[PDB]
Structures are given as structure tokens and as C-alpha cells.
Design a binder for these strands. Sequence first.
DNA 1: CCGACGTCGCATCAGC
DNA 2: GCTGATGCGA
DNA 3: GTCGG
Length: 321
Amino acid sequence: LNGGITDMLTELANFEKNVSQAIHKYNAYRKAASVIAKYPHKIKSGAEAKKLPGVGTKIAEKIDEFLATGKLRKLEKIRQDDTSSSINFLTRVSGIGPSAARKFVDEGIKTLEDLRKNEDKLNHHQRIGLKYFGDFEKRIPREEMLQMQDIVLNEVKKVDSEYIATVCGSFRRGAESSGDMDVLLTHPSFTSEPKLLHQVVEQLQKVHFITDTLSKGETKFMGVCQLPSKNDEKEYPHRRIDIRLIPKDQYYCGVLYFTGSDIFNKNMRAHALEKGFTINEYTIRPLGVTGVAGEPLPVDSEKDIFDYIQWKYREPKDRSE
DNA sequence: CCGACGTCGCATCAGC
DNA sequence: GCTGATGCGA
DNA sequence: GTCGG
Ligand code: NA
Ligand code: NA
């Protein structure tokens, strides 16, 4: 419908983030693309688009040029710019952000082939990113996520039967494919007021599900994993997996949040204000008359939170908005 | 006109 | 060596 | 770049 326009805007968004280092303009272009992607008519003028929340003057001007000519002069130029297109491209490697990519490109390093010739100039994280460059840009079909979940719930339970683990993200909401796996972990010995994460990571490296580590501390693990290769069949791609340990009395707040979607969370947080509650990723708190937040309220399920705000429990499946 | 635009854990850097 | 800033991804 | 106090 408006694929032309939203690829244009998404492409422009990337140059802002990666080359210009203008994070807010990146987010403006993305938000403009989203609204346009949802617009159920083929757009005829920038004026038509400007009416949508997140489309201003400059993007209207650009939509008009694209409609009249089928291209954007600035984008054509940017796209053919040797420096910018390389900087933009290197940020596709996980761990190479806009600043490292600018440095690489300053000293001549432009391509994966170049990154490969200069491993010693990469931190740990960036090497992993480079190694799994193709695998990381693949999506993960739901089927494989169920298999991955099977493994993670098994090996958690097998470390200590009292752990609670939940695979969140769009997967929890029923999505047909995911970008990564987001695992939220908790245990009744850990509240707000030991080795609980290391032990679980250890078990998953021990049965060869976890294959690499990006980062790991007391509360959050970022790394890589892979389903076991079925007899003589082709090996599965390597996948991104995060695991976070969350205090028991903040866990359901964490699950609700990390399940999303972003839009859904936005609605609920708003609805929660007008009902006198502040909900962050951690806690739900009451708001006194002058706007001052009281003690985090006890939460023992996702549902407890909905109750607090006089809303009816909605399944992850329908938390689309 | 002009500031907000999310916030934070971890790894690694810059400064002392 | 320690502490805070910054880059990064989410 | 867009919005809104
Ligand atoms: Na507008
Ligand atoms: Na990157």
C-alpha cells in the first residue's frame, strides 16, 4: 500500500541512528513509518499523510517528492555515499554501534571481510556478532521457539524445582516467529528487601544449549544458543537469548512488561494513571492526591495488576494493543 | 521557542 | 586500583 | 523530526 514511503522512512531512520547519531530523529522516522504502515489507504499527497500523528512538515515534503518522482534525492545521495553506507552497514554487526562503526570506517575498515582481517580490533561482543552475522538476522519460527522453551524450562526445573521461568516477548503473545528469546527468571529466595543466575546459565552451557556469552552479571545474561542437530539433518541457526533474574515480588511486573506489546503497555500505563496508579517495569504504586507515589503494592500474578486498576485480565494473545 | 523524546545492566573506556 | 562516563542493546 | 507546554 505505502511500502515505498515506509521503506524510504525506515531507510532514513537508519542513517539518522547510525551515521548522524541522532537517536531522536531515528525514533521520529520509525514512528512516522509505523503510523503510515497502519494506514488503510494508499497515500496520495504529503498533506494527507501530515494528518497522522507523527508526520510533520518535513516528511510531508518528502512524501510529495517520492510520489511525484519515485525517489528521494537525499536518500539516493546518502545510499551511494561510500562512507555513510559502510558505517550504516557495520552497525548490523551486534556490538558495533554507530560510534565503533564510524571509527572502523575512519581507518579503512568497511566490510565483514575487513572485520575478519582485523579481529584484534574487536571486543568479545563484536566477535560474536561477527561470527553469527547471518544467523542473527534470521527470524525464529514459533516451532523452534517451542523446542527452545522445552529445553529452557526443563533445565531450569532440573537445577532447582523452585525456580519460575517464563518465555516472554511476542512469542508469549502467540506470534508465529521471534527475533530472539527473552527469558524471565525468579526464585522465592530472591526478593527486593547468591548464584541464582550463574547456576542456570551453567546448566544450559553444560547440556550445550548455550554456546556463547555476550554479557553476564548477577541479574542479566545476554548470549547465544542453538537447538541440537537432528541426526544427519542441517544444523539450526545460532540464536539470541537473554535471561534476567528478577526479585520474586517484582516478577509479575516484569513478565507483564516484557510480554508487551509496547503499544499495549502504553495504554495500560495511561489507564493506570487515571485510576491513580503508577506502573513501571518493576512495581505498581498508588499516587496520592498531590501526585506522590506510595509503597509498591503486593503483586502475586499478572492478574493482580489488572485487578488493582479495574481492568479484565487479557491473555498475552490479545495484548496486541 | 525550545526541551522531551525510556531507562538500565554490563563491558570497557577515561580520568585520577 | 577505583569511580564515573560512555557505548551498546534491549 | 515531531509534538506540545
Ligand atoms: Na501532523
Ligand atoms: Na550493532
